[PDB]
Protein backbone atom coordinates (compact mmCIF):
# COMPACT_ATOMS: atom_id res chain seq x y z
CA UNK A 1 0.00 0.00 0.00
CA UNK A 2 3.01 2.24 -0.58
CA UNK A 3 2.60 5.43 -2.59
CA UNK A 4 4.91 7.76 -4.45
CA UNK A 5 6.20 10.40 -2.00
CA UNK A 6 6.22 13.99 -3.18
CA UNK A 7 9.67 15.53 -3.62
CA UNK A 8 10.68 18.27 -1.14
CA UNK A 9 11.39 20.59 -4.10
CA UNK A 10 10.53 21.21 -7.74
CA UNK A 11 11.89 18.96 -10.48
CA UNK A 12 14.24 21.75 -11.62
CA UNK A 13 15.33 22.90 -8.15
CA UNK A 14 18.62 20.92 -8.27
CA UNK A 15 19.97 22.57 -11.43
CA UNK A 16 22.72 22.80 -12.55
CA UNK A 17 23.73 19.71 -10.59
CA UNK A 18 20.91 17.41 -11.75
CA UNK A 19 18.81 18.20 -14.79
CA UNK A 20 15.06 18.71 -14.54
CA UNK A 21 14.20 16.04 -17.11
CA UNK A 22 16.13 13.38 -15.17
CA UNK A 23 14.51 14.33 -11.85
CA UNK A 24 11.04 14.01 -13.40
CA UNK A 25 11.67 10.70 -15.19
CA UNK A 26 13.57 9.24 -12.22
CA UNK A 27 10.64 10.09 -9.94
CA UNK A 28 7.49 9.51 -12.00
CA UNK A 29 8.82 6.55 -14.02
CA UNK A 30 11.58 4.66 -12.19
CA UNK A 31 10.46 5.14 -8.57
CA UNK A 32 6.77 4.68 -9.41
CA UNK A 33 7.61 1.37 -11.11
CA UNK A 34 9.42 -0.04 -8.06
CA UNK A 35 6.44 0.98 -5.91
CA UNK A 36 3.95 -0.65 -8.28
CA UNK A 37 6.01 -3.84 -8.54
CA UNK A 38 6.39 -4.38 -4.80
CA UNK A 39 2.71 -3.51 -4.25
CA UNK A 40 1.59 -6.20 -6.72
CA UNK A 41 3.80 -8.83 -5.09
CA UNK A 42 2.66 -7.95 -1.55
CA UNK A 43 -1.07 -7.87 -2.41
CA UNK A 44 -3.02 -10.43 -0.40
CA UNK A 45 -0.04 -11.31 1.81
CA UNK A 46 0.59 -10.77 5.51
CA UNK A 47 3.49 -8.43 4.64
CA UNK A 48 1.44 -5.82 2.76
CA UNK A 49 1.12 -3.39 5.70
CA UNK A 50 4.73 -2.93 6.83
CA UNK A 51 6.91 0.19 6.60
CA UNK A 52 9.23 -0.17 3.62
CA UNK A 53 12.35 -0.03 5.82
CA UNK A 54 11.09 -2.83 8.08
CA UNK A 55 10.14 -5.06 5.14
CA UNK A 56 13.53 -4.72 3.45
CA UNK A 57 15.31 -5.46 6.76
CA UNK A 58 13.49 -8.82 7.10
CA UNK A 59 14.21 -9.82 3.47
CA UNK A 60 15.99 -13.10 4.23
CA UNK A 61 13.11 -14.19 6.51
CA UNK A 62 10.46 -13.77 3.81
CA UNK A 63 9.15 -16.73 1.80
CA UNK A 64 11.19 -17.70 -1.24
CA UNK A 65 8.56 -16.50 -3.72
CA UNK A 66 8.64 -12.97 -2.25
CA UNK A 67 12.38 -12.38 -1.70
CA UNK A 68 13.05 -11.53 -5.35
CA UNK A 69 10.38 -8.83 -5.66
CA UNK A 70 11.08 -7.31 -2.23
CA UNK A 71 14.86 -7.18 -2.65
CA UNK A 72 14.71 -5.46 -6.04
CA UNK A 73 11.50 -3.45 -5.96
CA UNK A 74 11.11 -2.90 -2.24
CA UNK A 75 14.80 -2.07 -2.30
CA UNK A 76 14.19 0.41 -5.10
CA UNK A 77 11.41 2.05 -3.10
CA UNK A 78 13.35 2.47 0.14
CA UNK A 79 16.51 3.65 -1.62
CA UNK A 80 14.87 6.31 -3.81
CA UNK A 81 12.67 7.54 -0.97
CA UNK A 82 15.84 8.19 1.02
CA UNK A 83 17.65 9.66 -2.01
CA UNK A 84 15.14 12.46 -2.67
CA UNK A 85 15.33 13.70 0.91
CA UNK A 86 19.13 13.95 1.21
CA UNK A 87 19.25 16.37 -1.72
CA UNK A 88 18.42 20.06 -1.55
CA UNK A 89 18.69 23.18 -3.74
CA UNK A 90 20.42 24.75 -0.71
CA UNK A 91 22.69 21.76 -0.14
CA UNK A 92 26.40 21.21 -0.37
CA UNK A 93 29.08 22.44 1.97
CA UNK A 94 30.29 20.39 4.89
CA UNK A 95 28.38 18.47 7.57
CA UNK A 96 27.86 19.98 11.00
CA UNK A 97 26.54 18.85 14.36
CA UNK A 98 26.96 15.26 15.44
CA UNK A 99 27.38 13.84 11.92
CA UNK A 100 30.46 16.04 11.54
CA UNK A 101 31.83 14.79 14.87
CA UNK A 102 30.98 11.20 13.94
CA UNK A 103 32.67 11.59 10.55
CA UNK A 104 35.74 12.95 12.34
CA UNK A 105 35.84 10.13 14.90
CA UNK A 106 34.76 7.17 12.76
CA UNK A 107 36.07 7.98 9.26
CA UNK A 108 38.97 10.35 9.98
CA UNK A 109 37.45 13.58 8.71
CA UNK A 110 35.22 14.96 5.97
CA UNK A 111 38.05 14.84 3.42
CA UNK A 112 38.60 11.13 4.11
CA UNK A 113 34.88 10.40 3.98
CA UNK A 114 34.60 12.00 0.54
CA UNK A 115 37.65 10.07 -0.66
CA UNK A 116 36.03 6.82 0.46
CA UNK A 117 32.54 7.75 -0.72
CA UNK A 118 33.82 8.77 -4.15
CA UNK A 119 35.93 5.61 -4.47
CA UNK A 120 32.94 3.43 -3.57
CA UNK A 121 30.76 5.30 -6.07
CA UNK A 122 33.38 5.13 -8.84
CA UNK A 123 34.25 1.49 -8.18
CA UNK A 124 30.67 0.18 -8.35
CA UNK A 125 30.65 -1.67 -11.67
CA UNK A 126 27.21 -1.80 -13.23
CA UNK A 127 24.15 -0.46 -11.39
CA UNK A 128 24.16 0.28 -7.68
CA UNK A 129 24.46 2.76 -4.81
CA UNK A 130 27.12 4.35 -2.60
CA UNK A 131 26.18 4.62 1.08
CA UNK A 132 27.06 6.22 4.39
CA UNK A 133 25.52 3.92 6.99
CA UNK A 134 25.17 3.40 10.74
CA UNK A 135 26.20 -0.06 11.95
CA UNK A 136 24.61 -2.07 14.78
CA UNK A 137 27.62 -1.03 16.90
CA UNK A 138 26.58 2.60 16.23
CA UNK A 139 29.48 3.47 13.92
CA UNK A 140 29.63 4.98 10.45
CA UNK A 141 30.80 2.96 7.44
CA UNK A 142 31.07 3.79 3.74
CA UNK A 143 29.91 0.99 1.44
CA UNK A 144 28.34 0.24 -1.94
CA UNK A 145 25.66 -2.24 -3.00
CA UNK A 146 24.54 -3.76 -6.30
CA UNK A 147 21.29 -2.88 -8.12
CA UNK A 148 18.71 -1.94 -5.43
CA UNK A 149 20.28 -3.96 -2.61
CA UNK A 150 20.01 -1.99 0.60
CA UNK A 151 22.31 -2.02 3.66
CA UNK A 152 19.05 -2.40 5.64
CA UNK A 153 18.97 -6.18 5.17
CA UNK A 154 22.60 -6.29 6.33
CA UNK A 155 21.77 -4.73 9.71
CA UNK A 156 22.98 -1.23 8.76
CA UNK A 157 20.97 1.98 8.59
CA UNK A 158 21.87 4.16 5.59
CA UNK A 159 21.79 7.89 6.25
CA UNK A 160 23.17 9.15 2.93
CA UNK A 161 23.08 7.48 -0.48
CA UNK A 162 24.09 8.25 -4.05
CA UNK A 163 22.29 6.51 -6.92
CA UNK A 164 24.87 5.48 -9.52
CA UNK A 165 22.51 3.70 -11.88
CA UNK A 166 23.17 5.25 -15.27
CA UNK A 167 19.57 6.52 -15.40
CA UNK A 168 20.42 8.89 -12.55
CA UNK A 169 23.07 10.71 -14.58
CA UNK A 170 23.21 9.72 -18.26
CA UNK A 171 20.99 12.48 -19.72
CA UNK A 172 23.29 15.26 -18.49
CA UNK A 173 26.65 13.54 -17.83
CA UNK A 174 26.58 10.48 -20.13
CA UNK A 175 29.57 8.31 -19.15
CA UNK A 176 31.15 10.95 -16.87
CA UNK A 177 30.10 9.52 -13.51
CA UNK A 178 32.95 11.25 -11.57
CA UNK A 179 31.56 14.60 -12.74
CA UNK A 180 28.10 13.52 -11.57
CA UNK A 181 29.53 12.46 -8.21
CA UNK A 182 31.14 15.89 -7.90
CA UNK A 183 27.76 17.55 -8.51
CA UNK A 184 26.12 15.32 -5.88
CA UNK A 185 28.39 16.87 -3.24
CA UNK A 186 27.07 20.32 -4.20
CA UNK A 187 23.49 19.19 -3.49
CA UNK A 188 23.83 17.04 -0.35
CA UNK A 189 21.31 18.09 2.31
CA UNK A 190 23.46 17.67 5.41
CA UNK A 191 20.60 18.90 7.61
CA UNK A 192 18.60 15.88 6.46
CA UNK A 193 21.66 13.65 6.91
CA UNK A 194 21.98 14.94 10.48
CA UNK A 195 18.31 14.17 11.10
CA UNK A 196 18.67 10.55 9.91
CA UNK A 197 21.83 10.07 11.98
CA UNK A 198 20.08 11.14 15.20
CA UNK A 199 17.33 8.61 14.48
CA UNK A 200 19.74 5.77 13.64
CA UNK A 201 21.41 6.33 17.02
CA UNK B 1 47.27 -4.90 -27.17
CA UNK B 2 43.59 -4.63 -28.01
CA UNK B 3 42.38 -1.70 -30.12
CA UNK B 4 38.97 -0.15 -30.81
CA UNK B 5 37.39 -2.01 -33.75
CA UNK B 6 35.89 0.15 -36.45
CA UNK B 7 32.13 -0.15 -36.81
CA UNK B 8 30.88 -1.80 -40.03
CA UNK B 9 28.69 1.27 -40.65
CA UNK B 10 28.33 4.98 -39.97
CA UNK B 11 27.24 6.19 -36.53
CA UNK B 12 23.78 7.12 -37.87
CA UNK B 13 23.28 3.96 -39.97
CA UNK B 14 21.03 2.29 -37.39
CA UNK B 15 18.42 5.05 -37.25
CA UNK B 16 15.65 5.04 -36.26
CA UNK B 17 16.42 2.08 -34.01
CA UNK B 18 19.56 3.44 -32.28
CA UNK B 19 20.45 7.14 -32.30
CA UNK B 20 23.68 8.41 -33.82
CA UNK B 21 24.84 10.22 -30.67
CA UNK B 22 24.52 7.05 -28.61
CA UNK B 23 26.32 4.95 -31.21
CA UNK B 24 29.23 7.41 -31.11
CA UNK B 25 29.39 7.71 -27.30
CA UNK B 26 28.85 3.97 -26.75
CA UNK B 27 31.68 3.16 -29.16
CA UNK B 28 34.29 5.90 -28.61
CA UNK B 29 33.79 6.30 -24.83
CA UNK B 30 32.32 3.17 -23.22
CA UNK B 31 33.97 0.56 -25.45
CA UNK B 32 37.28 2.47 -25.59
CA UNK B 33 37.38 2.61 -21.80
CA UNK B 34 36.92 -1.17 -21.46
CA UNK B 35 39.74 -1.66 -23.95
CA UNK B 36 41.99 0.82 -22.16
CA UNK B 37 41.36 -0.79 -18.78
CA UNK B 38 41.86 -4.40 -19.83
CA UNK B 39 45.07 -3.41 -21.65
CA UNK B 40 46.37 -1.79 -18.46
CA UNK B 41 45.53 -4.88 -16.43
CA UNK B 42 47.20 -7.22 -18.95
CA UNK B 43 50.40 -5.18 -19.35
CA UNK B 44 53.42 -7.22 -18.34
CA UNK B 45 51.47 -10.48 -17.97
CA UNK B 46 51.60 -13.79 -19.83
CA UNK B 47 48.07 -13.08 -21.11
CA UNK B 48 48.79 -9.85 -23.00
CA UNK B 49 48.81 -11.45 -26.46
CA UNK B 50 45.62 -13.56 -26.52
CA UNK B 51 42.41 -13.01 -28.52
CA UNK B 52 39.81 -11.46 -26.21
CA UNK B 53 37.33 -14.34 -26.57
CA UNK B 54 39.99 -16.89 -25.65
CA UNK B 55 41.04 -14.73 -22.71
CA UNK B 56 37.49 -14.30 -21.40
CA UNK B 57 36.81 -18.03 -21.83
CA UNK B 58 39.74 -18.82 -19.50
CA UNK B 59 38.54 -16.35 -16.83
CA UNK B 60 38.33 -18.86 -13.99
CA UNK B 61 41.96 -19.91 -14.51
CA UNK B 62 43.39 -16.36 -14.24
CA UNK B 63 45.23 -15.07 -11.15
CA UNK B 64 43.05 -13.46 -8.52
CA UNK B 65 44.25 -9.93 -9.25
CA UNK B 66 43.32 -10.29 -12.94
CA UNK B 67 39.87 -11.87 -12.57
CA UNK B 68 38.01 -8.66 -11.72
CA UNK B 69 39.52 -6.50 -14.47
CA UNK B 70 39.24 -9.17 -17.17
CA UNK B 71 35.71 -10.15 -16.17
CA UNK B 72 34.45 -6.56 -16.24
CA UNK B 73 36.67 -4.87 -18.85
CA UNK B 74 37.63 -7.89 -20.94
CA UNK B 75 33.99 -8.89 -20.81
CA UNK B 76 33.10 -5.36 -21.87
CA UNK B 77 35.47 -5.58 -24.84
CA UNK B 78 34.24 -8.99 -26.02
CA UNK B 79 30.57 -8.15 -25.58
CA UNK B 80 30.67 -4.85 -27.47
CA UNK B 81 32.86 -6.26 -30.25
CA UNK B 82 30.16 -8.86 -30.90
CA UNK B 83 27.38 -6.29 -30.50
CA UNK B 84 28.57 -4.00 -33.29
CA UNK B 85 28.71 -6.86 -35.81
CA UNK B 86 25.19 -8.26 -35.19
CA UNK B 87 23.58 -4.90 -36.00
CA UNK B 88 23.02 -3.65 -39.53
CA UNK B 89 21.35 -0.71 -41.32
CA UNK B 90 19.71 -3.40 -43.49
CA UNK B 91 18.79 -5.72 -40.62
CA UNK B 92 15.52 -7.12 -39.34
CA UNK B 93 13.27 -9.73 -40.85
CA UNK B 94 13.61 -13.40 -39.99
CA UNK B 95 16.73 -15.59 -39.70
CA UNK B 96 17.72 -18.02 -42.43
CA UNK B 97 20.08 -20.91 -43.07
CA UNK B 98 21.24 -23.20 -40.30
CA UNK B 99 20.49 -20.85 -37.40
CA UNK B 100 16.85 -20.69 -38.52
CA UNK B 101 16.56 -24.49 -38.43
CA UNK B 102 18.23 -24.58 -35.01
CA UNK B 103 15.79 -21.95 -33.71
CA UNK B 104 12.92 -24.15 -34.89
CA UNK B 105 14.36 -27.37 -33.45
CA UNK B 106 15.85 -26.06 -30.18
CA UNK B 107 13.76 -22.99 -29.30
CA UNK B 108 10.42 -23.79 -30.98
CA UNK B 109 10.47 -21.18 -33.72
CA UNK B 110 11.32 -17.56 -34.39
CA UNK B 111 8.20 -16.30 -32.61
CA UNK B 112 9.03 -18.38 -29.52
CA UNK B 113 12.66 -17.22 -29.63
CA UNK B 114 11.66 -13.54 -29.64
CA UNK B 115 9.26 -14.18 -26.77
CA UNK B 116 12.10 -15.75 -24.76
CA UNK B 117 14.70 -13.17 -25.83
CA UNK B 118 12.42 -10.24 -24.98
CA UNK B 119 11.57 -11.75 -21.58
CA UNK B 120 15.25 -12.27 -20.72
CA UNK B 121 16.08 -8.74 -21.86
CA UNK B 122 13.19 -7.16 -19.95
CA UNK B 123 13.70 -9.18 -16.76
CA UNK B 124 17.44 -8.46 -16.41
CA UNK B 125 17.37 -6.26 -13.32
CA UNK B 126 20.20 -3.74 -13.29
CA UNK B 127 22.89 -3.73 -15.98
CA UNK B 128 23.38 -6.68 -18.29
CA UNK B 129 22.91 -8.43 -21.62
CA UNK B 130 20.40 -10.73 -23.27
CA UNK B 131 21.94 -13.53 -25.34
CA UNK B 132 21.34 -16.18 -27.91
CA UNK B 133 24.13 -18.69 -27.30
CA UNK B 134 25.37 -22.11 -28.42
CA UNK B 135 25.95 -24.63 -25.63
CA UNK B 136 28.80 -27.16 -25.39
CA UNK B 137 26.35 -29.78 -26.66
CA UNK B 138 25.82 -27.52 -29.72
CA UNK B 139 22.26 -26.41 -28.98
CA UNK B 140 20.70 -22.95 -28.79
CA UNK B 141 19.75 -21.33 -25.48
CA UNK B 142 18.35 -17.91 -24.58
CA UNK B 143 20.02 -16.41 -21.52
CA UNK B 144 20.96 -13.18 -19.76
CA UNK B 145 24.05 -12.09 -17.81
CA UNK B 146 24.86 -9.38 -15.28
CA UNK B 147 27.12 -6.38 -15.99
CA UNK B 148 29.71 -7.48 -18.60
CA UNK B 149 29.67 -11.17 -17.68
CA UNK B 150 29.96 -13.21 -20.84
CA UNK B 151 28.54 -16.69 -21.53
CA UNK B 152 32.05 -17.46 -22.81
CA UNK B 153 33.48 -18.21 -19.40
CA UNK B 154 30.55 -20.57 -18.68
CA UNK B 155 31.25 -22.67 -21.77
CA UNK B 156 28.61 -21.07 -24.03
CA UNK B 157 29.30 -19.27 -27.30
CA UNK B 158 27.19 -16.13 -27.82
CA UNK B 159 26.10 -15.56 -31.41
CA UNK B 160 23.65 -12.68 -30.78
CA UNK B 161 23.46 -10.17 -27.94
CA UNK B 162 21.52 -7.10 -26.82
CA UNK B 163 23.10 -4.59 -24.44
CA UNK B 164 20.56 -3.61 -21.76
CA UNK B 165 22.87 -1.35 -19.78
CA UNK B 166 21.02 1.93 -19.50
CA UNK B 167 23.79 3.71 -21.44
CA UNK B 168 22.79 1.68 -24.53
CA UNK B 169 19.32 3.21 -24.73
CA UNK B 170 18.72 6.05 -22.25
CA UNK B 171 19.48 9.03 -24.52
CA UNK B 172 16.72 8.06 -26.96
CA UNK B 173 14.45 5.76 -24.94
CA UNK B 174 15.03 6.85 -21.31
CA UNK B 175 13.26 4.26 -19.14
CA UNK B 176 11.49 2.56 -22.08
CA UNK B 177 13.65 -0.54 -22.33
CA UNK B 178 10.78 -2.56 -23.94
CA UNK B 179 10.64 -0.01 -26.77
CA UNK B 180 14.38 -0.36 -27.31
CA UNK B 181 14.14 -4.17 -27.35
CA UNK B 182 11.46 -4.05 -30.04
CA UNK B 183 13.60 -1.72 -32.16
CA UNK B 184 16.64 -3.99 -31.74
CA UNK B 185 14.78 -6.71 -33.64
CA UNK B 186 14.57 -4.32 -36.61
CA UNK B 187 18.39 -3.89 -36.67
CA UNK B 188 19.59 -7.48 -36.13
CA UNK B 189 22.12 -8.65 -38.75
CA UNK B 190 20.92 -12.23 -39.13
CA UNK B 191 23.52 -12.81 -41.84
CA UNK B 192 26.23 -12.25 -39.19
CA UNK B 193 24.28 -14.31 -36.63
CA UNK B 194 24.27 -17.21 -39.09
CA UNK B 195 28.04 -16.87 -39.59
CA UNK B 196 28.57 -16.88 -35.83
CA UNK B 197 26.33 -19.95 -35.51
CA UNK B 198 28.21 -21.81 -38.25
CA UNK B 199 31.52 -21.04 -36.54
CA UNK B 200 30.17 -22.28 -33.20
CA UNK B 201 28.89 -25.28 -35.24
MN1 LIG C 1 17.45 5.35 -9.55
MN1 LIG D 1 27.39 -1.03 -23.52
Numbering used by the authors:
A (entry chain A), B (entry chain E): 2 to 202
Give passages from the manuscript.
Found within a gene class designated "pathogenicity, virulence and adaptation" in the annotated genome of Xanthomonas citri subsp. citri strain 306 is the sodM (XAC2386) gene, which encodes a predicted superoxide dismutase (XcSOD). Superoxide dismutases are metalo-oxidoreductases (EC: 1.15.1.1) that catalyze the dismutation of the superoxide radical (O2•-) into molecular oxygen and hydrogen peroxide (H2O2). Heterologous expression of sodM provided pure, homogeneous, catalytically active XcSOD, from which a high resolution structure was determined by X-ray crystallography.
XcSOD crystallized in space group P212121 with two monomers per asymmetric unit. XcSOD shows the well-known fold characteristic of both MnSOD/FeSODs and presents an overall RMSD of 0.35 Å on Cα atoms when a monomer is superposed on its closest homologue, the MnSOD from B. subtilis, which was used for molecular replacement. In the case of XcSOD the two monomers in the asymmetric unit are related to one another in such a way as to present all of the hallmarks of a dimeric enzyme consistent with the SEC results and the crystallographic symmetry. Residues which are important for defining the topography and electrostatic potential of the access channel to the metal are highly conserved and include Trp130 and Trp166 as well as His31,Tyr35 and Gln149 which participate in the conserved network of hydrogen bonds necessary for securing the metal-bound solvent ligand or superoxide. The electrostatic potential around the active site is very similar to that observed in other members of the FeSOD/MnSOD family and presents a halo of positive charge directing the substrate anion towards the active site.
